[PDB]
Amino acid sequence: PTLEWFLSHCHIHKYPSKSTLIHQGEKAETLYYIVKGSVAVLIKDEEGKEMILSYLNQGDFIGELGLFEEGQERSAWVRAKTACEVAEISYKKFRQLIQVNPDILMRLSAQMARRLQVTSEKVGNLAFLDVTGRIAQTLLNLAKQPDAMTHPDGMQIKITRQEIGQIVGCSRETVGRILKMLEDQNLISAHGKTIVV
Amino acid sequence: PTLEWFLSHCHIHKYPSKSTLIHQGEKAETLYYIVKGSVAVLIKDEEGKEMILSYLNQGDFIGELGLFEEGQERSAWVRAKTACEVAEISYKKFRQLIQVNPDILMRLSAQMARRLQVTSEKVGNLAFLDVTGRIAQTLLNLAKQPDAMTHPDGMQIKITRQEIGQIVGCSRETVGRILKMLEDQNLISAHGKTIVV
Amino acid sequence: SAAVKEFFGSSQLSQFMDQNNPLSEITHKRRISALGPGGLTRERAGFEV
Amino acid sequence: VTEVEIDGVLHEYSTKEGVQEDILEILLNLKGLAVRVQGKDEVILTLNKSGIGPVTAADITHDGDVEIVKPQHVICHLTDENASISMRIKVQRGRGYVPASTRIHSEEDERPIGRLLVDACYSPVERIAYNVEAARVEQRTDLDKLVIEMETNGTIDPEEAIRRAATILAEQLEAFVDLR
Amino acid sequence: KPLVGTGMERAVAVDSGVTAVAKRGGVVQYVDASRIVIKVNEDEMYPGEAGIDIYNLTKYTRSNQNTCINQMPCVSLGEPVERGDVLADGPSTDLGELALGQNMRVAFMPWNGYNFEDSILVSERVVQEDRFTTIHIQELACVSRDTKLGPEEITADIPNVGEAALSKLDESGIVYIGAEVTGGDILVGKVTPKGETQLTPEEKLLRAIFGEKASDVKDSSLRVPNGVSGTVIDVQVFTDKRALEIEEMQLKQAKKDLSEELQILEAGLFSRIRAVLVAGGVEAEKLDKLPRDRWLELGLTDEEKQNQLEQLAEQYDELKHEFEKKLEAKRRKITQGDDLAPGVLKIVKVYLAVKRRIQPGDKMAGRHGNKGVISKINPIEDMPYDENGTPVDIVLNPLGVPSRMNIGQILETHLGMAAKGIGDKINAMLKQQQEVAKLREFIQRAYDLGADVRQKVDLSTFSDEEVMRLAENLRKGMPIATPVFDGAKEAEIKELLKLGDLPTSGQIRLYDGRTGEQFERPVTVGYMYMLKLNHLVDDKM
Amino acid sequence: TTESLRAATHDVLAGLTAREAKVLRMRFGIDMNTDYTLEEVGKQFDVTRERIRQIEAKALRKLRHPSRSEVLRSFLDD
Amino acid sequence: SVITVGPYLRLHQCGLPKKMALELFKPFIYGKLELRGLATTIKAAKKMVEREEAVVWDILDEVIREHPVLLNRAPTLHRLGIQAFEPVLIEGKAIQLHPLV
Numbered sequence A, B: 001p002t003l004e005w006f007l008s009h010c011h012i013h014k015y016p017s018k019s020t021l022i023h024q025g026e027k028a029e030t031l032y033y034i035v036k037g038s039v040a041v042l043i044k045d046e047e048g049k050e051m052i053l054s055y056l057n058q059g060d061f062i063g064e065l066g067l068f069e070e071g072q073e074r075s076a077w078v079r080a081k082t083a084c085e086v087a088e089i090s091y092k093k094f095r096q097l098i099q100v101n102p103d104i105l106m107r108l109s110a111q112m113a114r115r116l117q118v119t120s121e122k123v124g125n126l127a128f129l130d131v132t133g134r135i136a137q138t139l140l141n142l143a144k145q146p147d148a149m150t151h152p153d154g155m156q157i158k159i160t161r162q163e164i165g166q167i168v169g170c171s172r173e174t175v176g177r178i179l180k181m182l183e184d185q186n187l188i189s190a191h192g193k194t195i196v197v
Numbered sequence C: 001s002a003a004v005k006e007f008f009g010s011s012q013l014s015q016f017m018d019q020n021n022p023l024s025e026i027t028h029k030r031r032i033s034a035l036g037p038g039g040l041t042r043e044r045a046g047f048e049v
Numbered sequence D: 001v002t003e004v005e006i007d008g009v010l011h012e013y014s015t016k017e018g019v020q021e022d023i024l025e026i027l028l029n030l031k032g033l034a035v036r037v038q039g040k041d042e043v044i045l046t047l048n049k050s051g052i053g054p055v056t057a058a059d060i061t062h063d064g065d066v067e068i069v070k071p072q073h074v075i076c077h078l079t080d081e082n083a084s085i086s087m088r089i090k091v092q093r094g095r096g097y098v099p100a101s102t103r104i105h106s107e108e109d110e111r112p113i114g115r116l117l118v119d120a121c122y123s124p125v126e127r128i129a130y131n132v133e134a135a136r137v138e139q140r141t142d143l144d145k146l147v148i149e150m151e152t153n154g155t156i157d158p159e160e161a162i163r164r165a166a167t168i169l170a171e172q173l174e175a176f177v178d179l180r
Numbered sequence E: 001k002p003l004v005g006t007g008m009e010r011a012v013a014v015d016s017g018v019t020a021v022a023k024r025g026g027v028v029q030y031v032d033a034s035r036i037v038i039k040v041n042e043d044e045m046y047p048g049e050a051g052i053d054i055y056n057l058t059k060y061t062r063s064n065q066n067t068c069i070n071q072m073p074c075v076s077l078g079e080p081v082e083r084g085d086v087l088a089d090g091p092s093t094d095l096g097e098l099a100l101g102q103n104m105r106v107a108f109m110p111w112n113g114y115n116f117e118d119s120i121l122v123s124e125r126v127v128q129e130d131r132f133t134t135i136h137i138q139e140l141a142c143v144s145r146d147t148k149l150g151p152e153e154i155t156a157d158i159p160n161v162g163e164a165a166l167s168k169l170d171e172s173g174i175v176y177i178g179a180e181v182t183g184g185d186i187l188v189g190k191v192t193p194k195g196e197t198q199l200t201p202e203e204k205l206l207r208a209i210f211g212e213k214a215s216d217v218k219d220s221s222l223r224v225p226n227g228v229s230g231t232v233i234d235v236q237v238f239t240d241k242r243a244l245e246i247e248e249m250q251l252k253q254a255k256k257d258l259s260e261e262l263q264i265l266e267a268g269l270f271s272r273i274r275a276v277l278v279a280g281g282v283e284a285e286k287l288d289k290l291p292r293d294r295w296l297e298l299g300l301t302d303e304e305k306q307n308q309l310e311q312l313a314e315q316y317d318e319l320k321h322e323f324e325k326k327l328e329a330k331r332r333k334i335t336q337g338d339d340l341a342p343g344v345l346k347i348v349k350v351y352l353a354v355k356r357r358i359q360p361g362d363k364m365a366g367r368h369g370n371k372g373v374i375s376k377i378n379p380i381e382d383m384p385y386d387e388n389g390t391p392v393d394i395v396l397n398p399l400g401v402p403s404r405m406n407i408g409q410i411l412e413t414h415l416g417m418a419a420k421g422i423g424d425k426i427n428a429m430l431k432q433q434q435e436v437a438k439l440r441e442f443i444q445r446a447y448d449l450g451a452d453v454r455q456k457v458d459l460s461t462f463s464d465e466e467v468m469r470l471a472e473n474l475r476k477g478m479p480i481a482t483p484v485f486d487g488a489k490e491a492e493i494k495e496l497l498k499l500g501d502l503p504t505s506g507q508i509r510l511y512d513g514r515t516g517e518q519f520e521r522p523v524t525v526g527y528m529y530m531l532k533l534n535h536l537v538d539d540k541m
Numbered sequence F: 001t002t003e004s005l006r007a008a009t010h011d012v013l014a015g016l017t018a019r020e021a022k023v024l025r026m027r028f029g030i031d032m033n034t035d036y037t038l039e040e041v042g043k044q045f046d047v048t049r050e051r052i053r054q055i056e057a058k059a060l061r062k063l064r065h066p067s068r069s070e071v072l073r074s075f076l077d078d
Numbered sequence G: 001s002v003i004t005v006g007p008y009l010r011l012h013q014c015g016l017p018k019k020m021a022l023e024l025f026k027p028f029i030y031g032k033l034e035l036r037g038l039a040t041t042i043k044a045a046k047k048m049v050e051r052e053e054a055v056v057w058d059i060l061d062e063v064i065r066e067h068p069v070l071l072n073r074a075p076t077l078h079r080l081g082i083q084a085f086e087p088v089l090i091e092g093k094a095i096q097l098h099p100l101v
């Protein structure tokens, strides 16, 4: 694809696990496209408290928010969940790419549309749903992302319990204790690996 | 200009207040463009209240999330705050419009970026910054987005402690209690119109 | 200019044309009168004229 | 030959902004239009055209069961670069006898809009004549033969014209033999 | 035309008009009723100019007396035009002679009180031809003026459920399929700001139900007046929801019009832009297949070409510039509300064209004072006919001709009957498609027929196809001149009529068809030349 | 038209309770030279005022009532 | 308006283009549309009569039956230039007139 003609002038960089891609406050000077790997988009308040905005997986762009306007700082931290083979395009050259071909932009805007939908959903969950419904929607959504195994009748997830903390953005004791409340209600079966019926 | 070009393909309806222009569950064929007026988006609850996700004014498109895929159902309700003039085209004509000309899609992309940004701040604040801090981020952003009179010594807003609350998420008598705390803290003044000093 | 305007655009004895027929418009162009300023009137003229 | 309905760019009575041909001269250019129908006894056509050049019958949305014998039978002309034209033509089936005048004299019905009624100068009955001879039976030589000179367009078998006529007369006069 | 003339027809059809001229030698580019385009030859074409020698043209128009104006050709392209010829006909002219009326059948009889006193009877068939049926362009207008409450705006908004009978319609709706519209409908929707009125509880409750926002911009739409069967053929103009629909749709209309105008007028020029590269080398297959724009990067050499690379670029500049200009002007002028001038807020214009079939009351006549009012149209089977089965166009009362003493009309009649006598010969020669020799023989036999005719032609001058054009243009009729006091004699018309194989006096037995019989005596038959008038029951009732 | 209208309003208003019809007729000045107020349905019948609002509203529903609103409906298009 | 002949008139007869029949006799047909009540009001009767109901024709004939009307030509020299005939309703735009008068 575009990926290989791209790769020949090497901007593709292979980053180890955790190695921070974006430090927010950097001046926006390059677009990315994750060719391999999973990424954490995340933010911090001044008093050390941190929140994850999204994971970002292969096929996705990092940093697009600065391509449109001059001289902006990067909106979130972007840190590698694992080993990442990552494209880099400079803005003044990627805009030439838009000028050459906007076909990419359709798929790009469809992804953005799904992102807006899920973000408005999250504001709804926050304002209007307590912890229980949030982690139900979690374990439900977890029962649909393509890594889940099947457990003959019902869905299976075993991510032990760290990555969910970073997806839904919560503590882990409360996840456990309400994983148990759902176990009483006969909707999950968890002993670390939670089976979503 | 290119807005004139867009509107020139459109078919402009008048809509007076409370008119529910878009509903959730119907199918997507029209992209909308607000010629005149201001509108409010909504989501409803399986049993309860609703959430305005954001407000939209003259200059915005509505409907676009359906644009990029066929057979897409409408995601939210969108109700008129004021009487509006809405420039409408169908998506097929829009695909024609994409091939014919750029630079509406770019403005649309810059807008999409801005909206993902401020709802992310909203989520940061819902998660990090407390309700007094949510009022702070919001009355800050509103001092940056104008509708005001720019009172010769001070600043004001026409707020009945209801739009600040609903943007943020709270109840009435309580935020009363707090903005009066803010008054005793010399942070606010209000009688029907709040003066954010 | 004001004169040659006024007079070419204000007069008796000038009026819209009989366009129904090339005959009517020639014989309108091949037409003679004994009236107008310095002329006769229907009530004053008789049979001799 | 029946009727026309014109509906186009502007208001729709009926020639608008860059047609030479005022209305009765397009229709009289459709009177001599020759259409054959084969399967059915009834038809409706449509036309749409635009842009500078002669407006003819080849542009007609011919129905598949319709034989247009002249695609060069002129209809109209488009003059202005801005001018464009959309109309509908009711080809034949009629009923009864000649024209529009006597038709609406019959027809109390008033019909919705677009419809421009037309005189019927037809097709396979053009002119006729006849001749009474004296039949030669050997003795009854004063008996009569007839000879009917008939003239048409094509599209009708005359023996069919004649059979239809006799069946018709039989059936009218059912109102006088069976009915009093 | 008139079959019977006096000779003065031609110079009057001419001197009511004027003439034209030609251009350089060439090949005729575009052919039309009124325009011709010629391309000048390469050797004649100067190198700087393109030399597309083009001509001008003609159109329709109203009269001072609400009648029709136009011009058409009586000629073909690719034929020599002798100077002073008529290249285009008029309202009342054809090949350069007068045309006031039509030529058709006559029989002089009483008939059941239908030609009692000066009235006229007529077959049905003449209006199947519409040949007397004809037109009246009429005019309608809209002054849009300054109103105190605000300018009259062009828009039309409506409450009061359905703004009724629109309530009862089908799904379609008076704008019904394909933008169809009835009599009474709107053409130009203008609204005028409205004052207020006494605030009675009923109507105020009604505009609390519907609630037209404020200032209540009263309706002033320009409509089809009642019963119109005319043609609102065009609109000139002189300078709410559906407000915006109609005006941005007016913009849809207009930009599509004018985007068309653009795309034609510059798709013209894109040939020369391309070609200008292909001069100075050839990108004989390097030019085309790669996208067209990227050709200036193809063949380029020293001094004289970069100037034309930039002339090319200047075209690229000027043209898109002028579109930016026109866009500004046009888009704002559709976007603007009505706010124009003192008293001229604006003026909108309309003209009509009423054409429908002729009916009793219309006044018809000939050229000897021979008037007549109409009293019925006669079915053809209900016309007098002959053993030929061929029925009469019209029946006239001869009650008055002794007391009217217009015997010239009689002579007119005979000399017309004989002329259809020759026209039918040429008709049969057409359907029978005679050999060139016979056409030559008969037609020269036709021209040199009279006693000692002052006027003389040979056909051996002409080729075959010229005689073919000649016979293919004469079939609506050849005329004849009976000069007024140098007129014809009983001997001539009688010799001429029997040359038609007709009766010497054109007196022929006629058959009624209400019973099929014969009448008692034969009747005078032959063709008169008659006149319509503006003195119509239309113009009288 | 006016005569038929107000004859029909007389015929419609003729059938109410006396209070409904009378407060309506006089309150809208129907059939005399006065401009009556609910301050005066107050000052005249009973110093009650707002029950006159809820009496007028009841009468309007009694009388719009499209078994009656149709002699009024030809006048929608006025 | 313009006149033409009635050859098949009886003496008492005269043409009447029903258009002007209607125009002159609208009060009778209105009173009669209220009497029957199809047009319940004069808005209704006037709109119904602009829309030319079929009953407007039969009732125009009803009203016009036995309903004389005058006839006047200029110049009215003596008494008999103006007379009164019975109507004969027609859709012929020309007045028909008994040839002997």
Ligand SMILES: Nc1ncnc2c1ncn2[C@@H]1O[C@@H]2COP(=O)(O)O[C@H]2[C@H]1O
Residues within 6 Å of the ligand: A022, A041, A053, A054, A056, A061, A062, A063, A064, A065, A066, A073, A074, A075, A076, A077, A078, A115, A119, B116, B120
């Ligand atoms: N709410 C979100 N959903 C998905 N991706 C996000 C979100 N917020 C930030 N990002 C991504 O994370 C990146 C952080 O830095 P940028 O703002 O430069 O570009 C950002 C986006 O690519």
Ligand SMILES: Nc1ncnc2c1ncn2[C@@H]1O[C@@H]2COP(=O)(O)O[C@H]2[C@H]1O
Residues within 6 Å of the ligand: A119, A120, B022, B041, B053, B054, B055, B061, B062, B063, B064, B065, B066, B074, B075, B076, B077, B078, B115, B116, B119
């Ligand atoms: N949180 C938000 N911030 C800004 N705009 C939003 C938000 N949520 C929804 N919208 C907009 O509101 C629209 C409602 O209908 P659509 O689904 O067509 O597209 C939606 C977006 O354009």
